[PDB]
Ligand binder design. Structure first.
Ligand SMILES: [Ca+2]
Ligand SMILES: [Zn+2]
Ligand SMILES: [Zn+2]
Lengths: 43, 44
């Protein structure tokens, strides 16, 4: 019953497909997508 | 300079992982990103 936000981009759980929770942080699917580009070094 | 940065999700330092991606006062390593992929894709 509270708005949760991606710690990287700031979007809430209501703006993304999925919001993954760490111990005290969160990351959305869009940022994970971006992380893959960074790690794989590809577009 | 010289300071240890940790993945905010698993706690590993930048010397324990391949890459540590930085956000605003938050970090995530390549291993946790791999896990996130399994979570999003809902597969193993
Ligand atoms: Ca040091
Ligand atoms: Zn995000
Ligand atoms: Zn990690």
């Amino acid at each position: 019953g509270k708005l949760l936000y991606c710690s990287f981009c700031g979007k809430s759980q209501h703006e993304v497909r999925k919001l993954i929770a760490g111990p005290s942080v969160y990351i959305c699917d869009e940022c994970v997508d971006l992380c893959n580009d960074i790690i794989r070094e590809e577009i």
